[PDB]
């Protein structure tokens, strides 16, 4: 397990976690109001964030 | 400024009595079931008493309290050892809670026996009673209508000697015996 050591990004930078659930909340609100383009924009930004990490 | 705590809350007993009354003192006797040795408490026992381990450097106030503040009151930081110590200190609690949980679901499931000790302890020790139900323990029932009377424990401290100060009792007390070392 010394070769497989993994550290989750939701720990070592809290900024990423913050912006992540930030966008999750945003996306939920977009689902409730009925904005499709907005929701797609938000999930795209979130995906790009996570694989940037 | 400075910190003195014996407790997590910081509380204590009322360390000083009312003026003009008698103080309560700790028992100085080492805590032992047998009354006869009567032995004063060791320094180590006094440290066990006062809420340390045996040593000044464990479990007391001398660990839990930060070595230093800053001037403005900004406290210290968490050492690897501090965090490890907190883990140990919670390891004791987890241990205790799990043990208690096991006891509780054991007497929920009803596996706690009404007979004290295991079978190995039962056939080692003639203290634990025989738990026989419908018979008397010793043969058949005793009639309903003092061992020491015939048992002699009298320790003879000084061995009685042979009367050389009397001529007749010297030869009348003669022991006819030949010393033999084992071959």
């Amino acid at each position: 397990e010394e070769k497989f050591v993994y550290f989750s990004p939701f720990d070592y930078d809290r900024t990423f976690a913050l912006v992540d659930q930030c966008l999750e909340r945003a996306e939920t609100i977009f689902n409730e109001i009925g904005d499709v383009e907005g929701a797609i924009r938000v999930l795209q930004q979130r995906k790009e964030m996570i694989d940037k990490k | 400024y400075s910190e003195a705590r014996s407790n997590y809350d910081g509380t204590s007993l009322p360390a000083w009595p009312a003026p003009g009354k008698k103080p309560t003192y700790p028992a100085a006797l080492s805590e032992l079931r047998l009354p006869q040795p009567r032995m004063r408490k060791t320094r180590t026992e006094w440290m066990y008493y006062h809420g340390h381990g045996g040593c000044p450097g464990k479990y007391g106030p001398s660990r839990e309290i930060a070595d230093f503040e800053y001037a403005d009151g900004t406290p210290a930081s968490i050492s690897g050892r501090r965090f490890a110590f907190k883990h140990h200190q919670d390891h004791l609690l987890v241990q205790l809670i799990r043990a208690a949980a096991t006891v509780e679901r054991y007497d929920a499931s009803g596996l706690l026996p009404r007979i004290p000790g295991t079978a190995e302890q039962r056939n080692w020790d003639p203290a634990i009673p025989l738990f026989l139900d419908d018979v008397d323990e010793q043969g058949r029932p005793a009639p309903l209508r003092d061992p020491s009377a015939f048992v002699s424990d009298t320790v003879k401290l000084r061995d009685d000697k042979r009367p050389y100060w009397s001529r007749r009792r010297w030869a009348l007390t003669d022991k006819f015996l030949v010393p033999k070392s084992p071959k």
Binding site: - | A4, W16, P26, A28, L29, R40
Partner: protein, 76 residues
């Protein structure tokens, strides 16, 4: 294995078993300057001792010396 050469503490008078009873400390110090050390009780549970200073104690020593040597005079 070698003989132990570390320094040994002197033997100390044996207790009469009175010490075993609680409220009786087994340190017996009742000495000349004893009454001057005044004990006060802090709120902490710690104590507070009031004592004469260094030069006061030594001045007392000097007075006792002079007072023992007033008779026969002072030797070198």
């Amino acid at each position: 294995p070698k003989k132990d050469r570390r320094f040994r503490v002197q033997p100390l008078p044996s207790l009469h078993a009175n010490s075993l009873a609680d409220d009786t400390p087994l340190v017996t110090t009742t000495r000349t300057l004893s009454p001057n050390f005044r004990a006060f009780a802090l709120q902490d549970g710690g104590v507070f001792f009031t004592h004469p200073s260094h030069e006061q104690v030594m001045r007392v020593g000097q007075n006792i010396l002079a007072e023992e040597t007033k008779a026969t005079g002072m030797t070198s």
